[PDB]
Amino acid sequence: MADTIVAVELDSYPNTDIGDPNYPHIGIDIKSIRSKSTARWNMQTGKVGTVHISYNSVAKRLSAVVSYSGSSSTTVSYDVDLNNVLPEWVRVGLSATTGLYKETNTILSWSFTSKLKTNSIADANSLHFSFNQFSQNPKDLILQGDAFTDSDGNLQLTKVSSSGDPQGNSVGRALFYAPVHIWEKSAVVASFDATFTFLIKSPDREPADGITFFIANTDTSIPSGSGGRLLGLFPDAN
Amino acid sequence: MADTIVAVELDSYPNTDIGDPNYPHIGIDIKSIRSKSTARWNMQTGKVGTVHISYNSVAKRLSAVVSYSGSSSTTVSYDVDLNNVLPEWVRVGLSATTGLYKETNTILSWSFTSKLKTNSIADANSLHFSFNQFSQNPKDLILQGDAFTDSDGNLQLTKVSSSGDPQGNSVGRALFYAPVHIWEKSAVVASFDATFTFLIKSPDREPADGITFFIANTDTSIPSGSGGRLLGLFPDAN
Amino acid sequence: MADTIVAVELDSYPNTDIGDPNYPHIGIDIKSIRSKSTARWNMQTGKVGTVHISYNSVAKRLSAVVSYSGSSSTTVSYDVDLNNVLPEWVRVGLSATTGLYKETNTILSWSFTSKLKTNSIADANSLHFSFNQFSQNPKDLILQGDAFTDSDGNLQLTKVSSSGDPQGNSVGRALFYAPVHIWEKSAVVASFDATFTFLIKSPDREPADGITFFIANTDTSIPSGSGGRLLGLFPDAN
Amino acid sequence: MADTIVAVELDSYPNTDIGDPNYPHIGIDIKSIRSKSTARWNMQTGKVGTVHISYNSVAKRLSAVVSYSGSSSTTVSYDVDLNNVLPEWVRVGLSATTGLYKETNTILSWSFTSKLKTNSIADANSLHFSFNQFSQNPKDLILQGDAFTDSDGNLQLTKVSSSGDPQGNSVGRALFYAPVHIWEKSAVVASFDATFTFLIKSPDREPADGITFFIANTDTSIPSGSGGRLLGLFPDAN
Ligand SMILES: OC[C@H]1O[C@H](Oc2c[nH]c3ccc(Br)c(Cl)c23)[C@@H](O)[C@@H](O)[C@@H]1O
Ligand SMILES: OC[C@H]1O[C@H](Oc2c[nH]c3ccc(Br)c(Cl)c23)[C@@H](O)[C@@H](O)[C@@H]1O
Ligand SMILES: OC[C@H]1O[C@H](Oc2c[nH]c3ccc(Br)c(Cl)c23)[C@@H](O)[C@@H](O)[C@@H]1O
Ligand SMILES: OC[C@H]1O[C@H](Oc2c[nH]c3ccc(Br)c(Cl)c23)[C@@H](O)[C@@H](O)[C@@H]1O
Ligand SMILES: [Ca+2]
Ligand SMILES: [Ca+2]
Ligand SMILES: [Ca+2]
Ligand SMILES: [Ca+2]
Ligand SMILES: [Mn+2]
Ligand SMILES: [Mn+2]
Ligand SMILES: [Mn+2]
Ligand SMILES: [Mn+2]
Ligand SMILES: [Mn+2]
Ligand SMILES: [Mn+2]
Ligand SMILES: [Mn+2]
Ligand SMILES: [Mn+2]
Description:
Strand content of chain A: 35-45%
Radius of gyration of chain A: 17 Å
Bound molecules: 5-bromo-4-chloro-1H-indol-3-yl alpha-D-mannopyranoside, calcium ion, manganese (II) ion
Number of helices of chain A: 0
Structural class of chain A: mainly beta
Distance between the termini of chain A: 15 Å
Shape of chain A: globular
CATH architecture of chain A: Sandwich
Binding site for Mn(2+) (chains A, B, C, D): 9, 11, 20, 25, 35
Oligomer: homotetramer
Protein name (chains A, B, C, D): Lectin alpha chain
Largest sheet of chain A: 8 strands, antiparallel
GO molecular function, one term (chains A, B, C, D): identical protein binding
CATH topology of chain A: Jelly Rolls
CATH class of chain A: Mainly Beta
InterPro entries (chains A, B, C, D): ConA-like_dom_sf (IPR013320), Lectin_LegA_CS (IPR000985), Lectin_legB_Mn/Ca_BS (IPR019825), Legume_lectin_dom (IPR001220), Leguminous_Lectin (IPR050258)
Binding site for Ca(2+) (chains A, B, C, D): 11, 13, 15, 20, 209
Helix content of chain A: under 10%
């Protein structure tokens, strides 16, 4: 049985044969690579970008924003009730790919908070983590595929040479080690927010393929055939 | 020279003559007592209730949920860009009233978090406070009208007798002492979250008038003529 | 090789044989059951207690306080550099035992925060979790020995019958699932704090054996021979 | 009539005639400019520094660490019960002065957390603010003397010219707007943590005079005659 995925994609490469708009874009992916909602993303290759993501079960609106120093931001939102989509326990992560074309998929920092409140006025259960650099052997991350942490304390989701040159046909992901509780039968409100900073560099005219923040079943793994345009998340483009 | 008001009301008394639905309701108030959105509130007089309020500038949805132990919740939301409504600096507060009819408007706890993030590398600016108990002399609150802290460590927004019985024609508010920064020219995303627990008791078969969490110009004060149905927030019913 | 243990013990049963003082006590344990520091704990069996523990690497003072509603608190401290003791990556946990004599070792809530500041700017890393009730399937806990979560949402560290009657000769522990990063080469300051609430009930005249909060090597497991007076932490009394 | 002051000073200029050690030093000040504890400061004029300060009422140890890019660290600690020094309600702030000699007293960020926990089931009361830039009109700061926010979003505690050259005989302070509750009779534990980053530059061979983080009576003001060596904090050198 396939994983169940919700993701925010920073999609650098337009794959118009599988429903991408014809420009780099941000998107909200609900169980499919074909985003439920997109916005045109004005990439700044070579510059550090920031992504902020948030949701809560009352508003039922998942939103993301991407910005760079000085520049205008790109936003995207989608109305969705995540408890109709995801299981009650999840893992959260980051993924990235390259394909025929390539780019660095470098993460410089990543934080995440979730809260789960029940009517029983026990206060909310909560989880927060923050990484402002990464350990070169990160015991609180599950690294999958080609993901690794370099000597600069950067998380490299996809392969780069010793010179820092990105490689094609690469896929990797990093999940936080602890499962996250995002609903239960008695729950009143669940919320989460996530931030990460990133550095996509590329020598290619058309960099590819992009980076995501994603939420999945706890035992999620890189699907077979999920390289390139599928962002290490899906086994097909349905 | 009137205040600028955004509020979530727990309106226990139907004033159908000024547009209330004909039942106790939770509502979102944008510069008018006449709610832009309401939902039926199934009151549990004598039982401790919990309200959670959330907003962010990307999703632009103001949401609130009210619940009691072992009971279903009631939610209300309204799509609104708060930057088009409120000033950049605000104060946040709780208000309550009684009129001809009455209830205790007792607050057992109140917390609030705000974050403001700009395009810069700088992490979000933030404020958080949490009161799970109120001090006899709460120097971090601006107490307005009949509002006072009692011997049990509770905030009473409106008058109660020496034996704990509510009095009619009362108005009271409590503002957090520090102004909150909610937008800036340079801003990328702003968000706030708030929670309070409340205890409404009444000897009246129909209690009145309600409690709000509100946001306003920093110099906000109880308007003249704001008693009873106007919840201590508005000078008229327009 | 043997685990590395730093613990705060709530030691309900005096084993004067192995150096316990002749009264219930709160103790700080560094690599030995024989506490580096103790203070008398005036137990209130059948009443909900609270423990707060804190440390930072500049002050180098590990402190704990135990209290009950309307009671005098008891404090214990020890001056130690915890990096002389602990590995850079640890798991944090709660343990309990019963032996010949018994008690319930019930956990009603548990929170923990750690922060590590280096050379990057704001926290190289932070981790916080808060459990105000425990799920029936707590996927973010590693439960060892007899530890289980019950129908009331409490964490029971040691065995209880269907009636809630504690059992003798029981051992149980619960670890937070994710490893915690408490030091690295570039580190300037590291800190943590933890809080738990507990309900110890017993039909025995002298309840036994107690509860700890502990920090260990990530791969920590209940040592052979760690029953009773050794609190599920140590293979012997050295 | 005189303020009540607790401070951590970064004293760039040795005033031996008022009991400074004869080198730049960090110190802990309890109701006097004459530090109760000092450490030689591994000082790096022209480089951005970071300060971390912490205290809790159980350990009763006020500790500070100053470092630069995670290196050149200086630490100072002092054993003191702040309950016996400070009032229950305070304001927290930053101060800085120049005198005959001069330096920029630039603050690039400032954060603060306080927690106060009593016997009750009630969880901690708390306050947190984080400023990673300073806005043009900081309505949540009480700016005293020469302190202002500049075009870069930095807080300048003392006078700098239009070109960025520091001026002599300056004094400035910034207080967080909300009073902070650091103790109550029913308290079990109270704690606070403060961080700030700073940038001290000087065309002088000897910069002066220094920067402090301080905790005072809520109504604290710059004492008359508190320039230069007295750091904007004390009326005299007693
Ligand atoms: O990295 C960009 C893309 O490269 C590959 O698709 C192609 C894009 N342009 C091409 C041109 C020729 C050939 Br053959 C291929 Cl496979 C492609 C595939 O790996 C895609 O999944 C990926 O999105
Ligand atoms: O507390 C409930 C209500 O009591 C008063 O309104 C009346 C309720 N019943 C009435 C009957 C007659 C007249 Br006149 C009035 Cl104003 C009222 C007014 O104080 C209202 O503002 C308030 O909402
Ligand atoms: O639970 C209380 C204690 O019970 C046992 O030790 C004894 C305490 N009193 C005794 C009396 C007789 C014998 Br045999 C034993 Cl083992 C004990 C052992 O299980 C101890 O580890 C434990 O601390
Ligand atoms: O900025 C450094 C110092 O400059 C002044 O003190 C003097 C330093 N050298 C002097 C020489 C003569 C005289 Br009079 C004075 Cl006050 C001083 C005073 O402003 C001091 O408070 C300050 O610490
Ligand atoms: Ca694509
Ligand atoms: Ca009404
Ligand atoms: Ca013992
Ligand atoms: Ca000096
Ligand atoms: Mn796409
Ligand atoms: Mn947000
Ligand atoms: Mn209404
Ligand atoms: Mn919330
Ligand atoms: Mn012991
Ligand atoms: Mn603490
Ligand atoms: Mn000095
Ligand atoms: Mn700290």
